[PDB]
A and B are shown apart, each in its own frame.
Chain A
């Protein structure tokens, strides 16, 4: 299967209640392995997966140092963004940043990414070539001018094609039992009357990993996508994921309806039936 390493950063200003709250997390695929919280007592980058705990003191020290440097850089960003947008001191605002890399089945580099948002909206993103910038409004054009003059793309590119992939492979190796696994969904459908003339059909997928899955309802082979309630894929808390899709059907037409489950752990996609 293909793999990814991504780091996620959130900084939130807090007018007159001290400094911005900064939270960082790192993931390999859908498995979190580090956190930093600016409000916690430890002030340390902390392990959140068992296979990261073996990393020695240099690692923890280096990641604590770098994570703090990411935090200070976001504190500055919040100030700068309030000036670009002519915003007052009176309101809380949010900067988010995400970066990392994807590798293919052969663990070779596929793609790199480095994206910022302000107040929930795209701000600036490194393009696919790792040489250029997409800036989403006029303020972010000011950032693009500054980042081009300072050759920011080049330094990001060297990390994303090089270091990022090297550490992803190392984590994949060390955490092989956890990370190089696929757990196929355990599927079923439930049936419950909502009146004497309608029933809720709900198609379930349980205990699966990774999180990526497609659940779809058909009526006589036709997709029921506008009539389907699809919940967001959710963690079970044990390292696996769950999802369901439901339709409300007239009683008596159950046999017309089929659920269709697609997941990388399934040898073939499954069709579940009421007959």
Chain B
């Protein structure tokens, strides 16, 4: 069966500024089949109040989802996205990098 690996991006909606509320996004795209686990992490713990988009797909049939939560960046808080999917042999963690 066709299997396609998720492309994972973790990023803020607006340029991050400490003490200013924002939205943290994890966008996973290009994957197949649709069954996927996506969590947003704060200091390596699962963030509970995380919403996601409705399952959709691209011209090439691969799936995409946006997971998102409101957050206020600080100096010391570290964010990340944890994704598991049949194409990944272990969960993959992408760290949020604010200086890209």
Contacts and interface: CB of A to CB of B under 8 A. Distances in A.
Would A and B touch once assembled, by the CB under 8 A criterion? yes
Contact of A121 (B54, B57, B61): B61
Interface in B35-70: 35, 53-57, 61-63, 66, 68
Contacts of B100: 190, 202, 244
Tell me the dominant secondary structure on chain A's binding face: strand
Contacts of A202: 100
Contact of B11 (A10, A92, A122, A242): A242
A25 B55 CA distance: 8
A88 to B, nearest CB: 12
Interface residues of A, number: 32
A157 B55 CA distance: 27
A261 B100 CA distance: 18
A232 B55 contact: no
For chain B, give the interface size range.
Answer: 20 to 34
B54 A120 contact: no
Contacts of A256: none
Given A92-B35, A119-B2, A23 B27 contact: no
A120 B11 contact: no
B9 interface: yes
A12 B63 CA distance: 13
B99 A192 contact: yes
A117 interface: yes
A235 B25 contact: yes
A14 B9 CA distance: 29
Interface of B: 1-4, 7, 9, 11, 13-14, 23, 25, 27, 29-30, 32-35, 53-57, 61-63, 66, 68, 99-100
Interface of A: 8, 10, 12, 23, 25, 27, 32, 35, 37, 48, 91-92, 94, 96, 98, 117, 119-122, 190, 192, 202, 231-232, 234-238, 242, 244
